[PDB]
Write a protein that binds this ligand. Structure first.
Ligand SMILES: OCc1cn([C@@H]2O[C@H](CO)[C@@H](O)[C@H](O)[C@H]2O)nn1
Length: 810
């Protein structure tokens, strides 16, 4: 059908069709009289998978022969989403499979919808890992993603009576055609036990053993024949585990619970033992695998030359003391040499400055679970603090501040401090974030070792986030500038020369309209909700969090509603306000915010005076597959976190690439986005980081805003009195109380500027031509935010490896 989707040659189409029928028969054990759409999906998935394996085997053979430096990306989350279309895109099979299935009398897009998301992540951090894997493969790096194969990923969100309900994401029930179990490479992982000191050093003994079984998933590069591996560990009990008899077998679940479920927290630390076990489990199994591969090339001086370990947040921070443990206790290296190797091998990416998100493990947990690691952390700390003391003599406050061990009622290990000490590089994820790190929470460390601190602004893969989810836009762009931009997104700058091109303006606007119609149809079909596709699609999709300020969006929505109710017969630009995202199950305020959104919808969507001029939709079960649908459909991207709180954001970048304008604070990567596009082409509002600091200094008083803004008063009075909850007038008391008395994120302080800025948005939307021209200016300058750029920077500035667009033999 379209060019970017590749060739549909007669030879390939015929070959795909026969292998499809082969898999349906031999693999699925079905005939075409009993086969369901799901069977057809699996037959296609198996057919496409076959095309990966040849390239997968030869890529891994290529690495064995060339022995390049290997990159190990350690993450507790990989938010992969669906794999079928991505695989087709990267192998140039999309049109051929489209043709092959059509000739079999099947709609491929229908089959694509059957695939479950691999939802092994919470949001941005897990999705960043997924984009990174894609870019590393596309840039020909010898890279391995290492994580946990959760049996249950991020919960499926059901909305019931306006409330979030969670259900288990049983993503593996029908099987996962993409993974290959590798039980032959199963590794033991040790827990508990005790430390014994001998003549020949420390020994970790009397441990409980849990087996780590790897499952390998192929990660194809974009049309370069590179297929890298994501290896995910599954917890298995040893066969002599607890070996009355029946109970001992049933108690195997205790061990295997380690890989059972993803902790559903976004940007929030829950100090639970099971989570710590997960963190060590991935680290211990991964490091053995790394060392095994390294030895299969005794001399650990070359370890840092052949290995890079990237810590995605502090979650895999135990890699540092674990590497030390292995080098010192098992390989018998002296401390100093082991430490040198460790530091040069490890690098740490920080993703947050929110205090509640920072990992601080109680010493008593580490003492019981990982007694040798605690000893190593203590020794790391002492030697590190000796360096601090030597650099800043007499500065006893600094010593306390920089210690890996935090004092208090419960002693804790600050994992971020551990990571900085044991890494040669520490990076933030957007320029403003990296600067905040050096100025605030890691200031002491930056003063001690300024060379360690870097920025690596986040990115998104233009394969998934343009070509896959927005083929129409990919195509109209390719018509003008060719296909090279897909793996060289900076080429989108060439589109600046088309900003006054009447054909291009029409096409850009046509593609958006088509996307909106398709999404309006999706909503009716799958959720039975009526929306006006001519309205401005105003969308905020991301995890529900106070810092992300879905509440500020809510206030604006109510403002628009109240203004309509006051002047019913005045013209307002029609809007469909879509808000979606999951709340962590234990996050009460976030669950209340979801209820508020639906409560507002229940009032607004049924007011006859409003008509179709304002609709409020809560998008249920927001996830990667839903993002791929709603983002291409968006006109306005809400990126309205309090300045200084959203480390980068990546949703922002997705919207920019897909032809939405951005309303946002100068937070995270929004700053760089506005810088790239030009501030004129962004809807920037609200406090900057410095304004937030000034407000904190004099004290934030929400009442002041309430007293001085009548429109804001009205909303709060509406919330308090039960306007949006008549049967439970006090339902939103917690929300109002928080807003009025303990709002850490200063919702009210940005309200006026936000509403005003939103008026500027509506004004521009009234002029379709100028809206689209600004859209073109955004798409055209979104090149910097390709994860190919990000990964190339990691490669050159941290990992010490050169990216390559050179193709491997097919
Ligand atoms: O554990 C802290 C954390 C941070 N994050 C998110 O990481 C993303 C990827 O770097 C960022 O874009 C986002 O700003 C951050 O909140 N998720 N969890």
């Amino acid at each position: 059908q379209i060019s970017v989707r590749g060739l549909a040659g007669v030879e390939n189409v015929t070959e795909l069709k026969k292998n499809f029928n082969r898999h349906l028969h031999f693999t699925l054990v079905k005939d075409r009289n009993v086969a369901t759409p799901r069977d057809y999906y699996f037959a296609l998935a198996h057919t496409v998978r076959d095309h990966l394996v040849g390239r997968w085997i030869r890529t891994q053979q290529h690495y064995y022969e060339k022995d390049p430096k290997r990159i190990y990306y350690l993450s507790l989350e990989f938010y992969m989403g669906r794999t079928l279309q991505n695989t087709m895109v990267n192998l140039a099979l999309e049109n051929a499979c489209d043709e092959a299935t059509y000739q079999l009398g099947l709609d491929m897009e229908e089959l694509e919808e059957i695939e479950e998301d691999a939802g092994l992540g919470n949001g941005g951090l897990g999705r960043l890992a997924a984009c990174f894997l894609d870019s590393m493969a596309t840039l020909g790096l010898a890279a391995y993603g290492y994580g946990i194969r959760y049996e249950f990923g991020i919960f499926n969100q059901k909305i019931c009576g306006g409330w979030q309900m969670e259900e288990a994401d049983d993503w593996l029930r029908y099987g996962n055609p993409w993974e290959k179990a590798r039980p032959e490479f199963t590794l033991p992982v040790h827990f508990y036990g005790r430390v014994e000191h001998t003549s020949q050093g420390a020994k970790w003994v009397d441990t409980q053993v849990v087996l780590a079984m790897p499952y390998d998933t192929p990660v194809p590069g974009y049309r370069n024949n590179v297929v890298n591996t994501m290896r995910l560990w599954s917890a298995k009990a040893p066969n002599d585990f607890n070996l009355g008899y029946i109970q001992a077998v049933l108690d195997r679940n205790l061990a295997e619970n380690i890989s059972r479920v993803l902790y559903p927290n976004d940007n929030f630390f829950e100090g639970k033992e099971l989570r710590l076990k997960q963190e060590y489990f991935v680290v211990a199994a991964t490091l053995q695998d790394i060392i095994r591969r390294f030895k299969s090339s005794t001399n650990f001086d070359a370890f840092p030359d052949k290995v890079a370990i990237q810590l995605n947040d502090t979650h895999p921070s135990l890699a540092i003391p674990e590497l030390m443990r292995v080098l010192v206790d098992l390989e018998r290296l002296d401390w100093d040499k082991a430490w040198e190797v460790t530091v040069k091998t490890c690098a740490y990416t920080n993703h947050t400055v929110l205090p509640e998100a920072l990992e601080r493990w109680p010493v008593h947990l580490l003492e019981t679970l990982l007694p040798r690691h605690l000893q190593i952390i203590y020794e790391i700390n002492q030697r590190f603090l000796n360096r601090v003391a030597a650099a800043f003599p007499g500065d006893v406050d600094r010593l306390r501040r920089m210690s890996l061990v935090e004092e208090g009622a419960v002693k804790r290990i600050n994992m971020a401090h551990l990571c900085i000490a044991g890494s040669h590089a520490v990076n933030g994820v957007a320029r403003i974030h990296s600067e905040i790190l050096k100025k605030t929470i890691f200031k002491d460390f930056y003063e001690l070792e300024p060379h360690k601190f870097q920025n690596k602004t986040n990115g998104i893969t233009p394969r998934r986030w343009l070509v896959l989810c927005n083929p129409g836009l990919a195509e109209i762009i390719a018509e003008r500038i060719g296909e090279e931009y897909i793996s060289d997104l900076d080429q989108l700058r060439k589109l600046l020369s088309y900003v006054d091109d009447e054909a291009f303006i029409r096409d850009v606007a046509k593609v958006k309209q088509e996307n909106k119609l398709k999404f309006a149809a999706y909503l009716e079909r799958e959720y039975k909700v009526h929306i006006n596709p001519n309205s401005l699609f105003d969308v905020q999709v991301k995890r529900i969090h106070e810092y992300k300020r879905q509440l500020l969006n809510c206030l604006h929505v109510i403002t628009l509603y109240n203004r309509i109710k006051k002047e019913p017969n005045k013209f307002v630009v029609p809007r469909t306000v879509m808000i979606g995202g999951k709340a962590a199950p234990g996050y009460h305020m976030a669950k209340m915010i979801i209820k508020l959104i639906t409560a507002i919808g229940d009032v607004v969507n049924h007011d006859p005076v409003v008509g179709d001029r304002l609709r409020v939709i809560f998008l249920e079960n927001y996830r990667v597959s839903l993002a791929e649908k709603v983002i291409p459909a968006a006109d306005l991207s809400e990126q309205i976190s309090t300045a200084g709180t959203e480390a980068s954001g990546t949703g922002n970048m997705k919207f920019m690439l897909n032809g939405a304008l951005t309303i946002g604070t100068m937070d995270g990567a929004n700053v760089e986005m506005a810088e790239e596009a030009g501030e004129e082409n962004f809807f920037i509002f609200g406090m900057r980081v410095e304004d937030v600091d000034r407000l904190d200094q004099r004290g934030y008083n929400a009442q002041e805003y309430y007293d001085r803004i009548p429109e804001l008063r009205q909303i709060i009075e509406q919330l308090s009195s039960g306007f949006f909850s008549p049967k439970q007038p006090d339902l939103f008391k917690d929300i109002v109380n928080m807003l009025m008395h303990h709002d850490r994120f200063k919702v009210f302080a940005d309200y006026e500027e936000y509403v005003k800025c939103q008026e500027r948005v509506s004004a521009l939307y009234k002029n379709p031509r100028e809206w689209t021209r600004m859209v073109i200016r955004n798409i055209a300058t979104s090149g910097k935010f390709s994860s190919d750029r990000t990964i190339a920077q990691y490669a050159r500035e941290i990992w010490g490896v050169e990216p390559s667009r050179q193709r491997l033999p097919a």
